[PDB]
Amino acid sequence: DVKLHGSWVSPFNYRVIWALKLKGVEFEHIVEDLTNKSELLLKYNPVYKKIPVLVHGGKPIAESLVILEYIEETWPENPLLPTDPYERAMARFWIQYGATKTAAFGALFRASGEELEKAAKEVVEVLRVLEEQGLGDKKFFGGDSINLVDISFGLFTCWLEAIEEAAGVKVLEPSTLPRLHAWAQNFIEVPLIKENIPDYDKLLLHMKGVREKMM
Amino acid sequence: DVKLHGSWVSPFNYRVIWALKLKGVEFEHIVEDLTNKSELLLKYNPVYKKIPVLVHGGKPIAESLVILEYIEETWPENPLLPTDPYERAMARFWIQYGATKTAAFGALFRASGEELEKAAKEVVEVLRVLEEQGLGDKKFFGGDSINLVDISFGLFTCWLEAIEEAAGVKVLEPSTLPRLHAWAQNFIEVPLIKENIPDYDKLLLHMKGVREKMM
Ligand SMILES: O=c1cc(-c2ccccc2)oc2cc(O)c(O)c(O)c12
Ligand SMILES: O=c1cc(-c2ccccc2)oc2cc(O)c(O)c(O)c12
Ligand SMILES: [Cl-]
Ligand SMILES: [Cl-]
């Protein structure tokens, strides 16, 4: 009834895995090969031709952020968004902030030396705004348990750690971002996340390859 | 109770005006000067420091797409999104598609000659996907009346027409995009939109100035 056309490394695919497992939705995970795309993936997502694509009752939903909101409306139990409209708007605001700024992380795969240190400092400033104005003193962006904002920022945990090691730069450190660093550790220790994250060595290998091709 | 920190030319500000007028929400329009920003605008939106910012009961909501969804949840009468989760996901998918591709319109203000003709053809292909897969044979993206998808695409009407005249290129024409061109004419004739759009001559003057500074 529910199929997820995904991958074993994509952070965008992992957002959907987390949301489905939080709702207790049974699904079949179809891991696609991006070099030779299947006919189902091209028929279901003819606009971007990429993963993740959730297929529910034969009907496709593409784009991780679109899929998350579809999951939240379709399986409303164990809510991942607050009920108050102002609180929901603040959640969507921070989700879109991360989605817009995820581009500034691209420079971490391209730049080198005194240019890569400039990109890493810009990434720290992006995360500091998120820490001060978004997280604040809460344990999670969803308060006392993870919500769609935490899920949307999950790529700043082990995927970002892998990018840092592959690029030779530090971005999310306890000295400079104390509350966001504690959040990232707390997020990764949540049993749902801990049992559903790619192996670090495989993720690091992926980032090294991505940095090699993007120079 | 409701204040809108806006401008007389921003298409992003006009999305909010349309949604508020469709809900029948009374509001005070505070037109800001972008060169010398007021202290209220800096306090309400310290992340982007831009308009539109809706302030409801003293609480600020920034980013036009975030404000639209806040308006839809806060004043649920005269719905601007469908009730079915799959239909709502398709609406959000097309809204995010336009938001992501709005960047390809930037080249219309920068490029010249054989480079500007390449940018205009890429814009036509972006609009063709939207026409075939998004609009189809419906009168409006919301079916028989405008919804948040029509509102989000309203910038492709007179703002785009002004960019075309300022740049000396044609993008949305009846021969090449028959259904999207008929939609744009129908949208602009909706009395709510017709009574709430900037004067074309002032909008054209704005685009000419923007193209001049961006060369
Ligand atoms: O666009 C991508 C961005 C990042 C990323 C991770 C952490 C922090 C910032 C960005 O990981 C990725 C991995 C993939 O397998 C893939 O196909 C991708 O497009 C991306
Ligand atoms: O980013 C902008 C994009 C466009 C635009 C309009 C039609 C089609 C595509 C893009 O208009 C604008 C007008 C403004 O006053 C402003 O501050 C802006 O940032 C924009
Ligand atoms: Cl995605
Ligand atoms: Cl906006």
3-class SS letters over chain A = CEEEEECCCCHHHHHHHHHHHHHCCCCEEEECCCCCCCHHHHHHCCCCCCCCEEEECCEEEECHHHHHHHHHHHCCCCCCCCCCHHHHHHHHHHHHHHHHHHHHHCHHHHCCCCCHHHHHHHHHHHHHHHHHHHHCCCCECCECCCCHHHHHHHHHCHHHHHHHHHHCCCCCCCCCCHHHHHHHHHHHHCHHHHCCCCCHHHHHHHHHHHHHHCC
Exposed, middle or buried by CB within 10 Å (0-12, 13-18, 19+), for B185? exposed
| Residues whose CB falls within 8 Å of the CB of residue B64, separated by 6 or more in sequence, listed in order | B12, B13, B15, B16, B52
Cis status, amide bond into A60, omega within 30 of 0 = no
**Cis preceding-peptide flag for A52 (omega within 30 of 0):** yes
Give the separation between CA B73 and CA B20, rounded to whole angstroms.
12
Tokens of residue A199, six digits: 């192996």
Cβ(B149)–Cβ(B91) below 8 Å: yes
**Amino acid of residue A151:** I
Residue type, A80: L
Residues 6+ apart with CB under 8 A from B197: B14, B157, B158, B188
Q: How far apart are CA B20 and CA B77, in angstroms?
A: 12
Residue A197 contacts B where some CB pair is shorter than 8 Å = no
A165 and A204 in contact (C-beta within 8 Å)?
yes
State the best of A63, A125, A131 to mutate against chain B, taking most chain B CBs within 10 Å. Answer: A63
User: Using a 6 Å CB cutoff, which residues line ligand 2?
Assistant: B 9-11, 102, 105, 155-156, 159-160, 163
Considering just the CA atoms, what is the radius of gyration of chain B in Å? Answer: 17
CA gap A186, A182 in Å, rounded: 6
The candidate with the shortest Cα–Cα distance to B154, out of B136, B170, B166, B172, is: B172
Residues of A in contact with B88 (CB under 8 A): 69-70, 73
**PDB resolution in Å:** 2.0
Query: Which letter does DSSP use for residue B143 in this model?
Result: B
Domains of chain A, CATH where assigned: 2-74 (3.40.30.10), 85-214 (1.20.1050.10)
Cα–Cα distances in Å, from A52 out to A4, A171, A188, B37, B170? 7, 27, 21, 41, 35
Residues of chain B with a following break (C to N over 2.5 Å): none
Q: Tell me the two tokens of residue A92.
A: 């969507």
CB contact under 8 A, B133 and A88: no
Instruction: Determine the Cα–Cα distance for residues A177 and A132; give it in Å rounded to an integer.
Output: 9
Cα(B22)–Cα(B8) distance, integer angstroms: 19
Q: CA-CA distance, A54 to A45, in Å (whole number)?
A: 10
The values of phi and psi at residue A143, to 5°, are 90, -115
> Which experimental method was this entry solved with?
X-ray
Contact B65 A97 (CB under 8 A): no
Q: Which of B155, B161, B187 to mutate to test the pocket of ligand 2 (most atoms within 8 A of CB)?
A: B155
How far off is chain B from A47, nearest CA to CA, in Å?
8
